[PDB]
Each structure stands twice: as C-alpha cells, then as structure tokens.
Predict the structure of Heat shock protein HSP 90-alpha.
Amino acid sequence: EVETFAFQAEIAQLMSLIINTFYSNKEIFLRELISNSSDALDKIRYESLTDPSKLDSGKELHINLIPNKQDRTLTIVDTGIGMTKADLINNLGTIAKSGTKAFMEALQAGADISMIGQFGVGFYSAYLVAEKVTVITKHNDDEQYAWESSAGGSFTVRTDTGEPMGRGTKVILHLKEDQTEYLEERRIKEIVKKHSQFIGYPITLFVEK
Ligand SMILES: CCN1C(=O)CSC1=S
C-alpha cells in the first residue's frame, strides 16, 4: 500500500526553484540536514528529562554520515525524536508554507540560497544534489514509515518493512550523476569541518569498502 500526495503549490514552487536555479555553492545542503538532525536530537533529549522511558527505543544520541558509491547515495542518520505519519503528510508542510513564502520574498530582495535555513525550510536544499530523496523515520508514538519524493509535485508515504530503526530519521540522498563528489571522504570531512564543527552530538563519517 503506497499513498501518493500532492505537495502544496508553494512547496512545489520552492523545490522547482532549488532544482532549476544556477547556484554553485551546493555543499550547504549537508549543513542543513545535520542541523535538522541536531534539532531532532535536542527534542528527544529534552523530552527524556521528564519521561526517561522515551529513550527505551535507544539511549544513544548521534549522527552518522554513510556514503555508498555502488548505490550512489549519501545517507544522514540520526537517533532524534523521529516523525509521525501526521508530521510527514500534514505538520511539516503546514509550517513550511510560511517559511517558503518568507524565503522566496528574501530571495527577490537579494538573499541567496545559502540562507534557506534561516527560514526553517533547509530540508529542501537536499534537491541541490539529489535527484530523489527517501526518508525512513520512526517516532516513539507511531510506526516506521518511508517517505519519498523525486520532486515533480508529489511525494509518497508507506509503512516501511525494512530493518527496524528503533527511533530516529534516515535521509537517503540519491545523488545526481554530476554530484558524486559528496561521496568522497575528504570532501565530506571538509564540509563538516567548515559548516558543522560545533554540533553538540558525535558525527561519525563512515568510510566505504
Ligand atoms: C526529515 C525530512 N523532512 C523534513 O525535514 C521536512 S519534510 C521531510 S520528509
């Protein structure tokens, strides 16, 4: 059972802008996703202070970066609070609507794409480098879901039958054919050092075989 949904018009417009605009400083996508993971980690950590049983699905709070040249994917894994089915279909898009409006206004007034995270919609910068994004997520209060979109106005959600994650989010970037530099260890190290050096959680960059 795979459900297909339309993005709101404003969100679709934003992802077309990201895909079609000429903008060479694509590497900021990593900083935005790592920032999202850190936010999700902060949330489950704060919740656990008043309800320790929220860490029963995994006490480790961390971020893993996993390149795979064979599949041509870069995966950003966190053990943060995760997302419910309602988040995937409703809540994230509701919030993103006003952040997109503000970002798009700032752009025509002289801002640039690197400022996207100041507007709360840094996730869609993934389409600077990815032709398709698959998101696996598990929240304590819901089932494990796979979200997916190749842009083009629509996204899918299904119950995920793969390996159980426990709790957290896995963002799988299926990289565009000319963006495989973001599979290289030295390139990923450089970007993390430059843009994410003070994240308050361990970032482990896996190496490939
Ligand atoms: C975690 C992945 N993601 C967002 O951050 C906004 S929509 C979506 S799926």
Summary: The beta strands are 3-6, 63-68, 73-78, 130-138, 144-149, 154-159, 168-175, 203-205. Helices lie at 9-20, 28-50, 85-108, 185-195. The chain has one domain: 3-197. The two ends are 35 Å apart (CA to CA).
